[PDB]
Amino acid sequence: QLTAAQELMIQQLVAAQLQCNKRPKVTPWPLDARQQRFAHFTELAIISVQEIVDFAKQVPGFLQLGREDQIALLKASTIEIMLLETARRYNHETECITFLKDFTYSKDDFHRAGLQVEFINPIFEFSRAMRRLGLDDAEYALLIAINIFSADRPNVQEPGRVEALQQPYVEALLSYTRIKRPQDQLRFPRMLMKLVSLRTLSSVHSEQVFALRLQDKKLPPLLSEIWDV
């Protein structure tokens, strides 16, 4: 028993998000060698940032925000939404993440690009754990919508409005989980707890970025504006 709207709105979210997963050329992976790998990643990041914004514009409500809050919400949730997408494309038998249509990367490939274990491991711990919860399309879609409308992001001008926008997505997730598995009531909490983990991941990601500042690696100006100190 989801309302007629909820069921539809959820289909439109999943549609939107699929259309974004399907809707490009990057610096091919090496076979200097270290730097070509790093660049390769920063270009994957640039591409996902683009899908994420493309998705956001289609999340109902999002464009009711002023432009600066749109900016503020996306600046904060970008890396967090990324890690969700990574987690979602993690193959457990192979232990590799598959990125566009074909590409596969191991906990070691990440090491070759220049990332550090302090950041690399927790990403895989999170991908593993995200697999235990076993989310379907609808849940990832709502969870992402919920992450976007976080009234507590730095520099948000209309916190009240953002929370009111988040509210319906929380309701829909709550019901959905009460029906898909009326068995486990703790499934809803446990999903929200992942949002908590994402904040810590975002923080670890920033350290990873600061790290590269010394290890003579830097990101394109466009990503730099989103993630630098």
């Binding site: 940032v49 683009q50 914004v53 493309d54 432009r67 900016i71 600046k75 466009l222 989103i226």
Partner: peptide, 12 residues
């Protein structure tokens, strides 16, 4: 500031 987001938002 945040030209990547501003550009992507204006795009279209």
């Amino acid at each position: 500031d945040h030209q990547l987001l501003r550009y992507l938002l204006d795009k279209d």
